[PDB]
Paper text:
[name] catalyses the transfer of the acyl lipid chain from the sn-1 position of a phosphoglycerol lipid-donor to the α-amine group of the N-terminal, DAG-modified cysteine residue of the apolipoprotein, completing the formation of a mature triacylated lipoprotein. In Gram-negative bacteria, [name] enzymes are integral membrane proteins located in the inner membrane, and are predicted to contain a Nit domain and a transmembrane (TM) domain consisting of at least six helices. Using an in vitro assay, it was shown that [name] uses a ping-pong mechanism, including slow formation of acyl-enzyme intermediate (that is, the first step) and rapid N-acyl transferring to the apolipoprotein (the second step). Based on a current mechanistic model of the nitrilase superfamily, E267 of Ec-[name] serves as a general base to activate nucleophile (that is, the thiol group of C387) in the first step and to activate amine group in the second step of the transacylation reaction; C387 forms a thiol-acyl intermediate; and K335 provides part of the oxyanion hole to stabilize the tetrahedral intermediate of the reaction carbon.
Residue numbers in the entry: 9 to 304, 310 to 357, 361 to 504
The structure:
């Protein structure tokens, strides 16, 4: 009955994964969650917390193993070592689901509406907050993101994605209750609470501005990862990108190269950047591109700016530096010939400012975020400005090809657009390159694993959202209310 349960927690946990992309099955989030809620019924604190652990291990285990595809091909570690690192990651994250189920069974032992719809959402908010906070965090696989093409999307520009996580744990809980006690009362309250925001799906917190419509192009280079940083790749890369960029120079007002597309130091690319900038300002176009900067011996993962209304200068401020690093790591991959020899000294990154002004470019304001940073809703929100015309993010997702990793990243990126009511310009090396609407919709997209340019028209938008104005604290107030009430 119990062991049968645990096998079950693993199963409902892995059922969690199918809510996210590329599966896009959003009710699987509810099923997964009420799986957790219901399976934690009728058991002692510890056994329960172990069930929570098994649930989390189902989820993260089925859902972020793609980290392997990175560390195994590009770390070079034995093999069993890699698999160990992955299973350890999943398990570590499942400590949190266990802390959730733990404190839940300890402080609220009986199968009630109190437990499923008042305790669990507040507790889950704090345990997920922790999961995303401790050790710089890893807020990956939050069920709210499944609602991006789904109803409930309305909540996000009001109180953010975490409010959708809240509402989903609540609703799923009441369904768990309704189910195991065969009582229609929790079911009814579930359906009501789930359906209240459906009309929020149609509020437009923003105003289109067709007068500022432009042609945008994003060059998807598709430099193979293994080579990407070889001294003998550099020029084929600069040629690939320059030549993709050249026939658009009179027609596309704005062009983006993805993360560290220019795979060399800025100061070592001064002549190329100056000529490119000169040709750009002549033809009337603008460029935004990834590149690396070693400043005086601090090394920054960087976006720089060139072209019309944005003349290049190594001393310009119109630049962005990546803020969020993995608690270890973020180095520059070595030369191919040097990667097998390493186990038998790399350059690591320094952090850019938590708050960095928009990039200015051709009279466009761009709130930038590099790669992973686009999943940090709060940080993006803080860097966001009322005058911001677009969200910018550039990434290299080639570390995990063909995995679900890229699609999960993409999905979470859409939520920034929805949250802040701005279009999102998403440029990738081989990853998912796309233009996302001010409501998280995918306006334009190009296939991955292709060398290709995305070219389309984009219309920026203005005006704040409740979530733009407030950020997290209304949901935090709701949480504190719920939790302090939850101590009865
Ligand atoms: C014909 C129905 C007979 C069963 C009535 C009470 C069964 S027992 C009850 O059932 C719940 C769901 O199975 C469990 O979660 C709970 O721990 C258990 O005590
Ligand atoms: C500051 C450095 C300026 C360098 C000027 C080089 C411009 S070369 C470039 O050549 C292309 C070849 O077809 C022409 O189509 C394009 O119009 C011209 O801008």
């Amino acid at each position: 009955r119990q062991r049968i349960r645990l096998l079950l927690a693993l199963l409902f946990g892995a059922c969690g994964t199918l809510a996210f992309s590329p599966y896009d099955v959003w009710p699987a989030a509810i099923i997964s969650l009420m799986g957790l809620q219901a399976l934690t019924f009728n058991r002692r604190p510890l056994q329960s917390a172990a069930i929570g652990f098994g649930w989390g291990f189902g989820l993260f285990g089925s859902g972020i193993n793609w980290v392997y595809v990175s560390i195994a091909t590009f770390g070079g570690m034995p093999g069993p070592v890699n698999i160990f690192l992955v299973v350890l990651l999943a398990a570590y994250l499942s400590l949190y689901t266990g802390l959730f189920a733990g404190v839940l069974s300890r402080l609220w032992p009986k199968t009630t509406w109190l437990r499923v719809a008042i305790a669990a959402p507040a507790l889950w908010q704090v345990t997920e907050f922790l999961r995303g906070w401790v050790l710089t965090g890893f807020p990956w696989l939050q069920f709210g993101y499944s609602q991006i093409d789904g109803p409930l999307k309305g909540l996000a520009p009001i109180m953010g994605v975490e409010a959708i996580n809240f509402l989903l744990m609540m609703v799923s809980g009441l369904l768990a209750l309704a189910l195991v006690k065969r009582n229609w009362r929790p079911l009814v309250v579930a359906v009501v609470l789930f359906a209240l925001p459906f009309p929020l799906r149609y509020i437009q917190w923003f105003t289109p501005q067709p007068e500022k419509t432009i042609q945008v192009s994003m060059v998807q280079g598709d430099i193979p990862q293994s080579l990407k940083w070889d001294e003998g790749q550099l020029l084929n890369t600069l040629k690939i990108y320059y030549n993709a960029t050249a026939p658009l120079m009179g027609k596309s007002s704005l062009i983006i190269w993805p993360e560290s597309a220019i795979t060399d130091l800025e100061i070592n690319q001064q002549p190329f950047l100056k000529v490119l900038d000169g040709e750009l300002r002549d033809k009337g176009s603008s460029l935004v591109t990834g590149i690396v900067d070693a400043r005086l011996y601090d090394t920054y993962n960087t976006i720089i700016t060139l072209g019309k209304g944005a003349p290049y200068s190594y001393e310009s401020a119109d630049r962005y530096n990546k803020n969020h690093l993995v608690p270890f790591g973020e180095f520059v991959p070595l030369e191919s010939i040097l990667r097998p020899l390493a186990p038998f000294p790399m350059s690591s990154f320094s952090r850019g400012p938590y708050i960095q002004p928009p990039l200015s470019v051709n009279g466009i304001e761009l709130t930038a975020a590099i790669c992973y940073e686009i999943i940090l809703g709060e940080q993006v929100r803080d860097n966001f400005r009322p005058d911001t015309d677009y969200l910018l993010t550039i990434s290299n997702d080639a570390w995990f090809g063909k995995s679900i990793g890229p699609w999960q990243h993409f999905q979470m990126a859409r939520m920034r657009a929805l949250e802040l009511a701005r279009p999102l310009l998403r440029s990738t090396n081989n990853g998912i390159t796309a233009v996302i609407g001010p409501q998280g919709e995918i306006q334009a997209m190009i296939p991955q694993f292709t060398r290709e340019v995305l070219t389309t028209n984009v219309t920026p938008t203005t005006g704040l959202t409740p979530y733009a104005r407030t950020g997290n604290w209304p949901l935090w107030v709701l949480t504190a209310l719920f939790g302090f009430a939850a101590v009865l």
